[PDB]
């Protein structure tokens, strides 16, 4: 059983590298963020351009949707996050307090908190309603490459160039677990599985790993792609077959069978590093996006 993702749309319009694409939780929209300082909204099913959202004064490294698909948060080199009203395009809040580039961000499922990670080596937890920073976690000893809440919001996972993945108690901010590798390769991405029991972690040694983080046991490894330089998003795909999806520095999207670890498909067509991939919440649809020689987003569809 292998998927058959086929190219449906190429979305042009960003004028610098794309940095992150994410589907809205309600499946209607794709948001893209870019080094060109802009967010763009596109229809997930017909690829139609909807609007541009602007206001950051330097480039954007990540964007994320609220659980009701009504808000976005973005992380920028301008040391801020911004909360946006998707319908109006207006910046509702500017989140100030990081002292270097903000690299990654996410809402919790309740969507009353935002978590951010920064080049300043901290993880910050923010109140969505007020914009106040509630906690600053001294999370890592090098830039924080990813932050993610688990299914009920009670845990945060963070990853860093320092080689570590850490699990944090959201309520108290205390570190519950540190995952370590003896070779300490930079960890360039992490996220919880949809059910919250596992974490998927990328390291800059061309390797993805599935961890049972409570036992501290690596259950699966995925290889064959190229990832030595960039913080590339990876994903669980669960709408059809159970896959792992990642970008690659050889300009391809890689798809693996989660359980067997075999590569089941490679998607060709981008002309630069595929920095970001996203999986649609209900349809077998992948969004992918690439760096400066390409600057496009592609939408792909599979029958499984």
């Amino acid at each position: 059983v292998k998927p058959n993702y086929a190219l449906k749309f190429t979305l042009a319009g960003h004028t610098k590298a794309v940095s992150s694409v994410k589907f809205s939780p309600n499946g209607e929209w794709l948001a893209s963020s870019s080094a060109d300082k802009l967010i763009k909204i596109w229809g997930a099913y017909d690829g139609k351009f909807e609007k541009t959202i602007s206001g950051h004064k330097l480039g954007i490294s990540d964007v994320a949707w609220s659980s009701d698909s009504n808000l976005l948060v973005s992380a920028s080199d301008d040391k801020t996050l911004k909360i946006w009203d998707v319908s109006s395009g207006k910046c509702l809040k500017t989140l100030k307090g990081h002292s270097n580039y903000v690299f990654c961000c996410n809402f919790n499922p309740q969507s009353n908190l935002i978590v951010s990670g920064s080049f300043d080596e901290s993880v910050r937890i923010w109140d969505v309603k007020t914009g106040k920073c509630l906690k600053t976690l001294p999370a890592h000893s090098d830039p924080v490459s990813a932050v993610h809440f688990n299914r009920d919001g009670s845990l945060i996972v963070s990853s860093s160039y320092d080689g570590l993945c850490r699990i944090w108690d959201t309520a108290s901010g205390q570190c519950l677990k540190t995952l370590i590798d003896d070779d300490n390769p930079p960890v360039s991405f992490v996220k919880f599985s949809p059910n919250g029991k596992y974490i998927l972690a990328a390291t800059l040694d061309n390797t993805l790993k599935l961890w049972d983080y409570s036992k501290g046991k690596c259950l699966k490894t995925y290889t064959g792609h190229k990832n030595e330089k960039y913080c590339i998003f990876a994903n669980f795909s669960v709408t059809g077959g159970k896959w792992i999806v990642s970008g690659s520095e050889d300009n391809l999207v890689y798809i693996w069978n989660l359980q067997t670890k075999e590569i089941v498909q490679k998607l060709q067509g981008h002309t630069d590093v595929v920095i970001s991939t996203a999986c649609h919440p209900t349809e077998n649809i992948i969004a992918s996006a690439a760096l400066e020689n390409d600057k496009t987003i592609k939408l792909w569809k599979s029958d499984c």
């Binding site: 610098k16 590298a17 794309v18 940095s19 992150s20 963020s33 870019s34 080094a35 330097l58 480039g59 954007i60 490294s61 990540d62 920028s76 080199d77 580039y101 690299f103 080049f119 830039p143 330089k229 960039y230 913080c231 920095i275 760096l291 400066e292």
Partner: peptide, 7 residues
């Protein structure tokens, strides 16, 4: 640029 799009 943006930090994620730089090596």
């Amino acid at each position: 640029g943006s930090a994620r799009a730089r090596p």
